PDB file of C-alpha atoms and ligand atoms in Angstrom:
ATOM      1  CA  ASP A  28     -95.794  57.017  44.347  1.00 36.38           C
ATOM      2  CA  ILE A  29     -96.914  58.452  47.875  1.00 37.07           C
ATOM      3  CA  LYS A  30     -95.095  56.802  51.094  1.00 35.77           C
ATOM      4  CA  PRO A  31     -96.366  57.442  54.429  1.00 33.03           C
ATOM      5  CA  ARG A  32     -95.023  60.618  55.890  1.00 29.82           C
ATOM      6  CA  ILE A  33     -95.953  62.968  58.848  1.00 27.65           C
ATOM      7  CA  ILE A  34     -95.752  66.657  58.079  1.00 27.61           C
ATOM      8  CA  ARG A  35     -95.428  69.116  60.977  1.00 29.38           C
ATOM      9  CA  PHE A  36     -97.239  72.450  60.548  1.00 30.65           C
ATOM     10  CA  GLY A  37     -96.755  75.308  63.233  1.00 31.30           C
ATOM     11  CA  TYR A  38     -98.225  78.866  63.265  1.00 30.22           C
ATOM     12  CA  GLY A  39     -98.626  81.706  65.455  1.00 25.43           C
ATOM     13  CA  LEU A  40    -102.416  82.273  65.623  1.00 24.82           C
ATOM     14  CA  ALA A  41    -104.788  80.713  67.838  1.00 26.46           C
ATOM     15  CA  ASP A  42    -105.861  77.260  66.507  1.00 26.88           C
ATOM     16  CA  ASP A  43    -109.711  78.444  66.319  1.00 26.23           C
ATOM     17  CA  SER A  44    -108.685  81.616  64.224  1.00 24.30           C
ATOM     18  CA  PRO A  45    -109.999  81.282  60.643  1.00 22.15           C
ATOM     19  CA  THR A  46    -106.432  80.587  59.485  1.00 20.07           C
ATOM     20  CA  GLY A  47    -105.869  78.017  62.277  1.00 21.14           C
ATOM     21  CA  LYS A  48    -109.207  76.321  60.884  1.00 18.85           C
ATOM     22  CA  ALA A  49    -107.664  76.476  57.493  1.00 18.39           C
ATOM     23  CA  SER A  50    -104.547  74.856  58.605  1.00 17.04           C
ATOM     24  CA  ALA A  51    -106.713  71.825  59.941  1.00 17.90           C
ATOM     25  CA  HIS A  52    -108.587  71.920  56.551  1.00 17.97           C
ATOM     26  CA  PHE A  53    -105.133  71.653  54.739  1.00 20.91           C
ATOM     27  CA  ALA A  54    -104.194  68.668  56.843  1.00 25.76           C
ATOM     28  CA  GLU A  55    -107.690  67.053  55.985  1.00 22.75           C
ATOM     29  CA  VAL A  56    -107.137  67.583  52.288  1.00 21.53           C
ATOM     30  CA  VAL A  57    -103.596  66.220  52.263  1.00 21.36           C
ATOM     31  CA  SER A  58    -104.795  63.141  54.056  1.00 21.83           C
ATOM     32  CA  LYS A  59    -107.642  62.754  51.689  1.00 22.07           C
ATOM     33  CA  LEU A  60    -105.678  63.149  48.558  1.00 20.31           C
ATOM     34  CA  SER A  61    -102.952  60.876  49.859  1.00 18.58           C
ATOM     35  CA  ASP A  62    -105.188  57.950  50.797  1.00 18.95           C
ATOM     36  CA  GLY A  63    -104.306  58.882  54.459  1.00 19.14           C
ATOM     37  CA  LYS A  64    -100.447  58.098  53.985  1.00 16.69           C
ATOM     38  CA  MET A  65     -99.470  61.804  54.256  1.00 15.80           C
ATOM     39  CA  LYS A  66    -100.554  63.198  57.649  1.00 16.45           C
ATOM     40  CA  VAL A  67    -100.053  66.828  58.622  1.00 15.51           C
ATOM     41  CA  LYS A  68     -99.805  67.701  62.560  1.00 12.53           C
ATOM     42  CA  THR A  69    -100.742  71.257  63.086  1.00 15.33           C
ATOM     43  CA  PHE A  70     -99.319  73.165  66.212  1.00 17.01           C
ATOM     44  CA  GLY A  71    -101.066  76.335  66.670  1.00 17.68           C
ATOM     45  CA  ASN A  72    -100.955  79.256  69.218  1.00 21.62           C
ATOM     46  CA  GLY A  73     -97.062  79.638  68.694  1.00 21.87           C
ATOM     47  CA  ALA A  74     -96.523  76.199  70.107  1.00 23.89           C
ATOM     48  CA  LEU A  75     -93.437  75.856  67.822  1.00 23.91           C
ATOM     49  CA  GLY A  76     -92.623  79.678  67.998  1.00 26.45           C
ATOM     50  CA  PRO A  77     -93.414  82.733  66.264  1.00 25.77           C
ATOM     51  CA  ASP A  78     -93.061  83.554  62.632  1.00 24.71           C
ATOM     52  CA  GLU A  79     -89.461  84.203  62.899  1.00 22.60           C
ATOM     53  CA  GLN A  80     -88.605  80.861  64.482  1.00 21.55           C
ATOM     54  CA  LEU A  81     -91.271  78.932  62.063  1.00 23.36           C
ATOM     55  CA  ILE A  82     -89.230  80.550  59.069  1.00 23.33           C
ATOM     56  CA  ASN A  83     -85.829  79.343  60.320  1.00 23.23           C
ATOM     57  CA  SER A  84     -87.325  75.882  61.060  1.00 24.86           C
ATOM     58  CA  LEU A  85     -88.449  75.627  57.632  1.00 26.56           C
ATOM     59  CA  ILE A  86     -84.908  76.625  56.428  1.00 23.32           C
ATOM     60  CA  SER A  87     -83.464  74.075  58.690  1.00 24.30           C
ATOM     61  CA  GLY A  88     -85.792  71.233  57.990  1.00 26.08           C
ATOM     62  CA  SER A  89     -87.127  70.915  61.601  1.00 26.35           C
ATOM     63  CA  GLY A  90     -90.492  72.011  60.223  1.00 26.38           C
ATOM     64  CA  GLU A  91     -92.342  71.409  56.934  1.00 25.33           C
ATOM     65  CA  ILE A  92     -95.081  73.728  56.374  1.00 22.72           C
ATOM     66  CA  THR A  93     -95.973  77.041  58.187  1.00 18.40           C
ATOM     67  CA  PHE A  94     -97.965  80.329  57.166  1.00 21.46           C
ATOM     68  CA  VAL A  95     -96.293  83.634  58.217  1.00 22.22           C
ATOM     69  CA  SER A  96     -96.932  87.173  57.726  1.00 25.82           C
ATOM     70  CA  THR A  97     -94.968  88.861  54.879  1.00 26.67           C
ATOM     71  CA  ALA A  98     -93.322  91.415  57.271  1.00 24.83           C
ATOM     72  CA  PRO A  99     -91.033  89.036  59.061  1.00 28.75           C
ATOM     73  CA  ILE A 100     -89.945  87.871  55.494  1.00 26.88           C
ATOM     74  CA  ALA A 101     -88.473  91.273  54.990  1.00 27.22           C
ATOM     75  CA  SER A 102     -85.627  90.426  57.116  1.00 25.68           C
ATOM     76  CA  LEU A 103     -84.506  87.814  54.353  1.00 25.61           C
ATOM     77  CA  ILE A 104     -86.210  89.354  51.199  1.00 24.67           C
ATOM     78  CA  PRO A 105     -86.595  93.080  51.936  1.00 27.19           C
ATOM     79  CA  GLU A 106     -88.995  93.369  48.846  1.00 32.00           C
ATOM     80  CA  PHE A 107     -91.724  91.848  50.982  1.00 29.44           C
ATOM     81  CA  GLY A 108     -91.683  94.758  53.041  1.00 31.38           C
ATOM     82  CA  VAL A 109     -93.991  96.428  50.566  1.00 28.54           C
ATOM     83  CA  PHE A 110     -97.026  95.006  52.160  1.00 24.87           C
ATOM     84  CA  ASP A 111     -96.492  97.032  55.384  1.00 23.07           C
ATOM     85  CA  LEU A 112     -97.075 100.291  53.552  1.00 24.51           C
ATOM     86  CA  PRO A 113    -100.551 101.726  54.378  1.00 23.69           C
ATOM     87  CA  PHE A 114    -103.502 101.795  51.960  1.00 19.24           C
ATOM     88  CA  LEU A 115    -101.758  99.581  49.357  1.00 20.52           C
ATOM     89  CA  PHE A 116    -105.109  97.714  48.602  1.00 22.49           C
ATOM     90  CA  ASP A 117    -108.266  99.329  48.646  1.00 25.06           C
ATOM     91  CA  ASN A 118    -110.246  95.909  49.186  1.00 28.07           C
ATOM     92  CA  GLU A 119    -109.668  92.145  49.239  1.00 25.82           C
ATOM     93  CA  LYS A 120    -110.635  91.715  45.608  1.00 24.58           C
ATOM     94  CA  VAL A 121    -107.643  93.811  44.700  1.00 25.38           C
ATOM     95  CA  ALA A 122    -105.481  92.051  47.184  1.00 25.38           C
ATOM     96  CA  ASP A 123    -106.449  88.587  45.719  1.00 27.87           C
ATOM     97  CA  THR A 124    -105.945  90.022  42.167  1.00 29.81           C
ATOM     98  CA  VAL A 125    -102.553  91.541  42.937  1.00 25.70           C
ATOM     99  CA  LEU A 126    -101.055  88.787  45.084  1.00 22.03           C
ATOM    100  CA  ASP A 127    -102.182  85.930  42.694  1.00 23.42           C
ATOM    101  CA  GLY A 128    -100.952  87.834  39.743  1.00 22.55           C
ATOM    102  CA  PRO A 129     -97.465  88.698  38.624  1.00 23.09           C
ATOM    103  CA  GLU A 130     -96.514  90.954  41.152  1.00 22.67           C
ATOM    104  CA  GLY A 131     -97.089  88.384  43.847  1.00 19.05           C
ATOM    105  CA  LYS A 132     -95.172  85.779  41.955  1.00 18.86           C
ATOM    106  CA  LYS A 133     -92.129  87.885  41.608  1.00 19.77           C
ATOM    107  CA  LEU A 134     -92.027  88.085  45.465  1.00 16.91           C
ATOM    108  CA  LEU A 135     -92.727  84.267  45.676  1.00 18.13           C
ATOM    109  CA  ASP A 136     -90.187  83.718  43.281  1.00 19.99           C
ATOM    110  CA  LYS A 137     -87.348  84.942  45.869  1.00 20.44           C
ATOM    111  CA  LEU A 138     -88.151  82.444  48.454  1.00 17.61           C
ATOM    112  CA  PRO A 139     -86.278  79.349  47.145  1.00 16.91           C
ATOM    113  CA  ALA A 140     -82.836  81.129  46.999  1.00 15.83           C
ATOM    114  CA  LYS A 141     -83.444  81.606  50.818  1.00 14.72           C
ATOM    115  CA  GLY A 142     -84.751  77.716  51.222  1.00 12.31           C
ATOM    116  CA  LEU A 143     -88.189  78.256  51.292  1.00 11.25           C
ATOM    117  CA  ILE A 144     -91.131  77.492  48.872  1.00  8.22           C
ATOM    118  CA  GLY A 145     -94.000  80.286  48.584  1.00  8.74           C
ATOM    119  CA  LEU A 146     -97.018  77.641  47.806  1.00  6.70           C
ATOM    120  CA  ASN A 147     -99.498  80.644  47.551  1.00  5.96           C
ATOM    121  CA  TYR A 148    -100.789  83.553  49.367  1.00  2.00           C
ATOM    122  CA  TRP A 149    -103.423  83.510  52.248  1.00  2.00           C
ATOM    123  CA  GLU A 150    -105.331  86.251  54.028  1.00  2.92           C
ATOM    124  CA  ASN A 151    -104.284  87.751  57.179  1.00  2.00           C
ATOM    125  CA  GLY A 152    -106.007  90.745  56.443  1.00  2.00           C
ATOM    126  CA  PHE A 153    -106.829  94.490  57.160  1.00  2.00           C
ATOM    127  CA  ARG A 154    -105.098  95.592  60.249  1.00  2.00           C
ATOM    128  CA  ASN A 155    -106.936  97.620  63.227  1.00  2.00           C
ATOM    129  CA  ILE A 156    -105.538  99.661  65.876  1.00  2.00           C
ATOM    130  CA  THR A 157    -106.305  98.692  69.691  1.00  2.00           C
ATOM    131  CA  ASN A 158    -104.925 100.241  72.620  1.00  2.00           C
ATOM    132  CA  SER A 159    -105.457 100.368  76.301  1.00  2.00           C
ATOM    133  CA  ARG A 160    -104.551 104.198  76.866  1.00  2.00           C
ATOM    134  CA  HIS A 161    -107.380 105.996  75.167  1.00  2.00           C
ATOM    135  CA  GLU A 162    -109.888 106.096  72.056  1.00  2.00           C
ATOM    136  CA  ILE A 163    -107.786 106.715  68.880  1.00  2.00           C
ATOM    137  CA  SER A 164    -110.202 108.627  66.468  1.00  2.00           C
ATOM    138  CA  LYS A 165    -107.607 111.190  65.090  1.00  2.00           C
ATOM    139  CA  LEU A 166    -104.321 111.020  63.809  1.00  2.00           C
ATOM    140  CA  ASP A 167    -103.071 113.119  66.844  1.00  2.00           C
ATOM    141  CA  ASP A 168    -104.466 110.556  69.297  1.00  2.00           C
ATOM    142  CA  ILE A 169    -101.448 108.318  68.176  1.00  2.00           C
ATOM    143  CA  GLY A 170     -98.622 110.615  69.398  1.00  2.00           C
ATOM    144  CA  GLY A 171     -96.531 108.969  72.018  1.00  2.00           C
ATOM    145  CA  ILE A 172     -98.534 105.718  72.090  1.00  2.00           C
ATOM    146  CA  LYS A 173     -96.223 102.766  72.884  1.00  2.00           C
ATOM    147  CA  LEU A 174     -97.625 100.664  69.978  1.00  2.00           C
ATOM    148  CA  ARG A 175     -96.306  97.089  69.174  1.00  2.00           C
ATOM    149  CA  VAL A 176     -95.379  96.431  65.617  1.00  2.00           C
ATOM    150  CA  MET A 177     -94.229  93.604  63.523  1.00  2.00           C
ATOM    151  CA  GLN A 178     -90.700  93.254  63.245  1.00  2.00           C
ATOM    152  CA  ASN A 179     -89.301  94.941  60.150  1.00  2.00           C
ATOM    153  CA  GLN A 180     -88.074  98.593  59.451  1.00  2.00           C
ATOM    154  CA  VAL A 181     -91.036  99.338  57.346  1.00  2.00           C
ATOM    155  CA  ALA A 182     -93.558  98.905  60.126  1.00  2.00           C
ATOM    156  CA  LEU A 183     -91.290 100.701  62.770  1.00  2.00           C
ATOM    157  CA  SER A 184     -90.772 103.531  60.352  1.00  2.00           C
ATOM    158  CA  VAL A 185     -94.681 103.853  59.457  1.00  2.00           C
ATOM    159  CA  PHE A 186     -95.887 103.765  62.893  1.00  2.00           C
ATOM    160  CA  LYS A 187     -93.031 106.013  64.114  1.00  2.00           C
ATOM    161  CA  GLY A 188     -93.777 108.508  61.293  1.00  2.00           C
ATOM    162  CA  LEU A 189     -97.591 108.705  62.583  1.00  2.00           C
ATOM    163  CA  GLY A 190     -96.124 109.597  65.949  1.00  2.00           C
ATOM    164  CA  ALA A 191     -96.257 106.407  67.758  1.00  2.00           C
ATOM    165  CA  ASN A 192     -93.365 104.827  69.759  1.00  2.00           C
ATOM    166  CA  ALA A 193     -93.043 101.707  67.600  1.00  2.00           C
ATOM    167  CA  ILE A 194     -92.057  98.638  69.485  1.00  2.00           C
ATOM    168  CA  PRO A 195     -91.085  95.824  67.363  1.00  2.00           C
ATOM    169  CA  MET A 196     -92.222  92.486  69.055  1.00  2.00           C
ATOM    170  CA  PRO A 197     -92.906  88.665  67.960  1.00  2.00           C
ATOM    171  CA  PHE A 198     -96.757  87.982  68.135  1.00  2.00           C
ATOM    172  CA  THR A 199     -96.107  85.216  70.659  1.00  2.00           C
ATOM    173  CA  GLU A 200     -95.117  87.892  73.267  1.00  2.00           C
ATOM    174  CA  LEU A 201     -97.943  90.162  72.395  1.00  2.00           C
ATOM    175  CA  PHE A 202    -100.875  89.327  74.697  1.00  2.00           C
ATOM    176  CA  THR A 203     -98.677  89.463  77.733  1.00  2.00           C
ATOM    177  CA  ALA A 204     -97.257  92.862  76.684  1.00  2.00           C
ATOM    178  CA  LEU A 205    -100.757  94.143  76.327  1.00  2.00           C
ATOM    179  CA  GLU A 206    -101.927  92.617  79.768  1.00  2.00           C
ATOM    180  CA  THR A 207     -99.035  94.199  81.827  1.00  2.00           C
ATOM    181  CA  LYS A 208     -99.200  97.472  79.701  1.00  2.00           C
ATOM    182  CA  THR A 209     -95.567  97.076  78.800  1.00  2.00           C
ATOM    183  CA  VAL A 210     -97.071  98.403  75.397  1.00  2.00           C
ATOM    184  CA  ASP A 211    -100.156 100.570  75.024  1.00  2.00           C
ATOM    185  CA  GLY A 212    -101.619  98.754  71.975  1.00  2.00           C
ATOM    186  CA  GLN A 213    -101.052  96.803  68.922  1.00  2.00           C
ATOM    187  CA  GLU A 214    -102.720  96.478  65.458  1.00  2.00           C
ATOM    188  CA  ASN A 215    -104.146  93.409  63.575  1.00  2.00           C
ATOM    189  CA  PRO A 216    -107.132  92.141  61.803  1.00  2.00           C
ATOM    190  CA  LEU A 217    -110.391  91.759  64.010  1.00  2.00           C
ATOM    191  CA  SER A 218    -110.448  88.069  63.923  1.00  2.00           C
ATOM    192  CA  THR A 219    -107.112  87.729  65.475  1.00  2.00           C
ATOM    193  CA  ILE A 220    -108.162  90.493  67.988  1.00  2.00           C
ATOM    194  CA  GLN A 221    -111.107  88.518  68.688  1.00  2.00           C
ATOM    195  CA  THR A 222    -109.243  84.817  68.794  1.00  2.00           C
ATOM    196  CA  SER A 223    -106.268  85.940  70.598  1.00  2.00           C
ATOM    197  CA  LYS A 224    -108.407  87.694  73.231  1.00  2.00           C
ATOM    198  CA  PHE A 225    -106.798  90.874  72.762  1.00  2.00           C
ATOM    199  CA  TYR A 226    -110.208  92.795  73.557  1.00  2.00           C
ATOM    200  CA  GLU A 227    -109.864  91.352  77.192  1.00  2.00           C
ATOM    201  CA  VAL A 228    -106.801  93.795  77.707  1.00  2.00           C
ATOM    202  CA  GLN A 229    -107.381  96.255  74.979  1.00  2.00           C
ATOM    203  CA  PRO A 230    -110.646  98.508  75.923  1.00  2.00           C
ATOM    204  CA  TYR A 231    -110.420 100.678  72.681  1.00  2.00           C
ATOM    205  CA  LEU A 232    -110.569  99.577  69.127  1.00  2.00           C
ATOM    206  CA  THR A 233    -110.148 101.891  65.839  1.00  2.00           C
ATOM    207  CA  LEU A 234    -111.284 100.523  62.388  1.00  2.00           C
ATOM    208  CA  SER A 235    -108.510 101.944  60.700  1.00  2.00           C
ATOM    209  CA  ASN A 236    -107.798  99.137  58.190  1.00  2.00           C
ATOM    210  CA  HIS A 237    -104.563 100.964  57.526  1.00  2.00           C
ATOM    211  CA  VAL A 238    -102.483  98.325  56.249  1.00  2.00           C
ATOM    212  CA  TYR A 239    -103.263  94.737  54.438  1.00  2.00           C
ATOM    213  CA  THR A 240    -101.119  91.755  55.623  1.00  2.00           C
ATOM    214  CA  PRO A 241    -100.732  88.841  53.393  1.00  2.00           C
ATOM    215  CA  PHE A 242     -99.802  85.433  54.558  1.00  2.00           C
ATOM    216  CA  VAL A 243     -97.305  83.403  52.629  1.00  2.00           C
ATOM    217  CA  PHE A 244     -98.172  79.693  52.882  1.00  2.00           C
ATOM    218  CA  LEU A 245     -94.853  78.146  53.083  1.00  2.00           C
ATOM    219  CA  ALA A 246     -92.831  74.903  52.638  1.00  2.00           C
ATOM    220  CA  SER A 247     -89.427  74.119  53.459  1.00  2.00           C
ATOM    221  CA  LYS A 248     -87.611  73.752  50.244  1.00  2.00           C
ATOM    222  CA  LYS A 249     -85.072  70.970  51.695  1.00  2.00           C
ATOM    223  CA  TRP A 250     -88.020  68.828  52.490  1.00  2.00           C
ATOM    224  CA  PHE A 251     -90.240  69.785  49.425  1.00  2.00           C
ATOM    225  CA  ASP A 252     -87.365  68.709  47.038  1.00  2.00           C
ATOM    226  CA  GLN A 253     -86.900  65.290  48.509  1.00  2.00           C
ATOM    227  CA  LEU A 254     -90.772  64.725  47.926  1.00  2.00           C
ATOM    228  CA  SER A 255     -91.845  62.589  44.894  1.00  2.00           C
ATOM    229  CA  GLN A 256     -93.680  64.242  42.293  1.00  2.00           C
ATOM    230  CA  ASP A 257     -96.681  62.593  43.479  1.00  2.00           C
ATOM    231  CA  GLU A 258     -96.234  63.844  46.908  1.00  2.00           C
ATOM    232  CA  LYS A 259     -95.533  67.469  45.598  1.00  2.00           C
ATOM    233  CA  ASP A 260     -98.738  67.328  43.983  1.00  2.00           C
ATOM    234  CA  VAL A 261    -100.575  66.599  46.945  1.00  2.00           C
ATOM    235  CA  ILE A 262     -98.895  69.276  48.521  1.00  2.00           C
ATOM    236  CA  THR A 263     -99.814  71.999  45.952  1.00  2.00           C
ATOM    237  CA  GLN A 264    -103.305  70.791  45.187  1.00  2.00           C
ATOM    238  CA  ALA A 265    -103.984  70.678  49.090  1.00  2.00           C
ATOM    239  CA  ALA A 266    -102.504  74.386  49.022  1.00  2.00           C
ATOM    240  CA  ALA A 267    -104.865  75.552  46.434  1.00  2.00           C
ATOM    241  CA  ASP A 268    -107.993  74.187  47.801  1.00  2.00           C
ATOM    242  CA  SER A 269    -106.947  75.304  51.249  1.00  2.00           C
ATOM    243  CA  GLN A 270    -106.050  79.048  50.028  1.00  2.00           C
ATOM    244  CA  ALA A 271    -109.912  79.425  48.711  1.00  2.00           C
ATOM    245  CA  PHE A 272    -111.008  77.884  52.013  1.00  2.00           C
ATOM    246  CA  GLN A 273    -108.984  80.285  54.162  1.00  2.00           C
ATOM    247  CA  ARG A 274    -109.896  83.396  52.264  1.00  2.00           C
ATOM    248  CA  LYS A 275    -113.622  82.634  52.561  1.00  2.00           C
ATOM    249  CA  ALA A 276    -113.100  81.747  56.400  1.00  2.00           C
ATOM    250  CA  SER A 277    -111.020  84.802  56.927  1.00  2.00           C
ATOM    251  CA  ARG A 278    -113.675  87.108  55.395  1.00  2.00           C
ATOM    252  CA  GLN A 279    -116.516  85.580  57.232  1.00  2.00           C
ATOM    253  CA  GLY A 280    -114.381  85.376  60.302  1.00  2.00           C
ATOM    254  CA  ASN A 281    -113.937  89.322  59.876  1.00  2.00           C
ATOM    255  CA  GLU A 282    -117.523  89.861  59.781  1.00  2.00           C
ATOM    256  CA  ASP A 283    -118.234  87.651  62.728  1.00  2.00           C
ATOM    257  CA  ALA A 284    -115.423  89.302  64.696  1.00  2.00           C
ATOM    258  CA  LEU A 285    -116.928  92.641  64.314  1.00  2.00           C
ATOM    259  CA  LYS A 286    -120.305  91.583  65.569  1.00  2.00           C
ATOM    260  CA  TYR A 287    -118.719  89.761  68.496  1.00  2.00           C
ATOM    261  CA  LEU A 288    -116.567  92.708  69.641  1.00  2.00           C
ATOM    262  CA  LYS A 289    -119.371  95.191  69.220  1.00  2.00           C
ATOM    263  CA  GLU A 290    -121.771  92.858  71.056  1.00  2.00           C
ATOM    264  CA  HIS A 291    -119.212  92.420  73.756  1.00  2.00           C
ATOM    265  CA  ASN A 292    -119.155  96.432  74.377  1.00  2.00           C
ATOM    266  CA  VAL A 293    -115.613  96.817  72.998  1.00  2.00           C
ATOM    267  CA  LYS A 294    -115.726 100.702  72.493  1.00  2.00           C
ATOM    268  CA  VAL A 295    -115.300 101.254  68.721  1.00  2.00           C
ATOM    269  CA  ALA A 296    -113.997 104.291  66.888  1.00  2.00           C
ATOM    270  CA  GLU A 297    -113.031 105.256  63.329  1.00  2.00           C
ATOM    271  CA  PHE A 298    -111.090 107.852  61.482  1.00  2.00           C
ATOM    272  CA  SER A 299    -113.497 110.583  60.136  1.00  2.00           C
ATOM    273  CA  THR A 300    -113.259 111.483  56.402  1.00  2.00           C
ATOM    274  CA  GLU A 301    -111.192 114.556  57.610  1.00  2.00           C
ATOM    275  CA  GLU A 302    -108.906 112.402  59.917  1.00  2.00           C
ATOM    276  CA  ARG A 303    -108.297 110.096  57.064  1.00  2.00           C
ATOM    277  CA  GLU A 304    -107.114 112.784  54.889  1.00  2.00           C
ATOM    278  CA  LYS A 305    -104.761 114.020  57.596  1.00  2.00           C
ATOM    279  CA  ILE A 306    -103.231 110.162  57.856  1.00  2.00           C
ATOM    280  CA  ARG A 307    -102.994 110.145  53.770  1.00  2.00           C
ATOM    281  CA  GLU A 308    -100.902 113.288  53.991  1.00  2.00           C
ATOM    282  CA  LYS A 309     -98.623 112.162  56.701  1.00  2.00           C
ATOM    283  CA  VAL A 310     -97.951 108.824  55.282  1.00  2.00           C
ATOM    284  CA  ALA A 311     -97.308 109.883  51.616  1.00  2.00           C
ATOM    285  CA  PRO A 312     -93.772 111.165  52.372  1.00  2.00           C
ATOM    286  CA  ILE A 313     -92.873 108.025  54.522  1.00  2.00           C
ATOM    287  CA  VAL A 314     -94.026 105.667  51.973  1.00  2.00           C
ATOM    288  CA  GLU A 315     -91.928 107.795  49.477  1.00  2.00           C
ATOM    289  CA  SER A 316     -89.067 107.580  52.063  1.00  2.00           C
ATOM    290  CA  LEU A 317     -89.211 103.828  52.558  1.00  2.00           C
ATOM    291  CA  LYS A 318     -89.141 102.892  48.668  1.00  2.00           C
ATOM    292  CA  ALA A 319     -85.392 102.410  48.833  1.00  2.00           C
ATOM    293  CA  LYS A 320     -85.525 100.034  51.679  1.00  2.00           C
ATOM    294  CA  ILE A 321     -88.155  97.987  50.002  1.00  2.00           C
ATOM    295  CA  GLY A 322     -87.091  98.083  46.411  1.00  2.00           C
ATOM    296  CA  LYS A 323     -88.282 100.740  43.858  1.00  2.00           C
ATOM    297  CA  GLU A 324     -89.446  98.451  41.255  1.00  2.00           C
ATOM    298  CA  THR A 325     -91.476  96.298  43.809  1.00  2.00           C
ATOM    299  CA  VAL A 326     -93.082  99.224  45.531  1.00  2.00           C
ATOM    300  CA  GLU A 327     -94.168 100.913  41.979  1.00  2.00           C
ATOM    301  CA  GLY A 328     -95.196  97.546  40.298  1.00  2.00           C
ATOM    302  CA  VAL A 329     -97.348  96.428  43.201  1.00  2.00           C
ATOM    303  CA  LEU A 330     -98.921 100.003  43.317  1.00  2.00           C
ATOM    304  CA  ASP A 331     -99.669  99.870  39.527  1.00  2.00           C
ATOM    305  CA  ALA A 332    -100.929  96.509  39.679  1.00  2.00           C
ATOM    306  CA  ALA A 333    -103.422  97.471  42.279  1.00  2.00           C
ATOM    307  CA  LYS A 334    -104.481 100.604  40.304  1.00  2.00           C
ATOM    308  CA  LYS A 335    -105.253  98.232  37.433  1.00  2.00           C
ATOM    309  CA  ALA A 336    -107.202  95.918  39.849  1.00  2.00           C
ATOM    310  CA  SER A 337    -109.225  98.880  41.319  1.00  2.00           C
TER     311      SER A 337
HETATM  312  O1  TK8 B 401     -99.146  90.676  64.133  1.00  2.00           O
HETATM  313  C1  TK8 B 401     -98.421  89.841  63.508  1.00  2.00           C
HETATM  314  O2  TK8 B 401     -97.460  89.516  63.936  1.00  2.00           O
HETATM  315  C2  TK8 B 401     -99.303  89.326  62.554  1.00  2.00           C
HETATM  316  O3  TK8 B 401    -100.352  89.848  62.200  1.00  2.00           O
HETATM  317  C3  TK8 B 401     -99.572  87.544  62.848  1.00  2.00           C
HETATM  318  O4  TK8 B 401    -100.453  87.091  61.934  1.00  2.00           O
HETATM  319  C4  TK8 B 401     -98.323  86.718  62.799  1.00  2.00           C
HETATM  320  O5  TK8 B 401     -97.946  86.538  61.731  1.00  2.00           O
HETATM  321  C5  TK8 B 401     -98.179  85.830  63.416  1.00  2.00           C
HETATM  322  O6  TK8 B 401     -97.726  84.459  63.740  1.00  2.00           O
END
């Protein structure tokens, strides 16, 4: 029971980012599983707007499928803000375990009340600081930097607490803000820095890996609910296949991006062991400060699940 259907899948990252390629993979699997009857059309590079607009399009029904970072979802469901706390996940194995386990599912289960289906989590990844003002290799080097952040109170409060002038902006405005130096820098995974070309306007890169961002792979509930069960199964089966593809592509992409940026002579710094402890000390009270704006039980449950996975 599958009828011909065209499905629009907009997203913010470049079409040749790992997640852009995973979106094309999803399209291919949907076509395969539906004998070519269900056709997914991908619109990358922010062609259908940034995350905030994509979310709204799924709620309204103008769009069917997207992936977005968890951070803009915090404007609908504050508990999703948990992932903007620094150093939550020691590595990607911990992340997968927590996200695919009960603590991840509790959050996904809050989406339908807002008109969204969280099909599963994809990997945005560990975020790294870039800027055009000066090298950042110490906590103090962040003071007064105008740093674009994602658009929720947790991200703004974290970087303000680290001394930055935190400037929330949609991802789709970011390259130009960097190029014109309306902001000094930003922070994102290496493959995004590469495929969105931020290195062309960001001479400095710090391998801070300070935050891990999940993507949520999303379907419009209004749209999903009017699918037949056979068609829903195509979507959920393709989503499971594509998650595995995505995560592998993301992790290979992270390795490839580091190699590329280094070989391109981007200037790369890190936080020494001492500076790392300074950052940990400064973060701990702002993390505690933000539990009330995320949800105490969410923060503590994610932290406990991460400990058990680590
Ligand atoms: O910096 C950001 O906003 C995120 O990292 C991106 O992936 C964003 O979701 C994209 O569309």
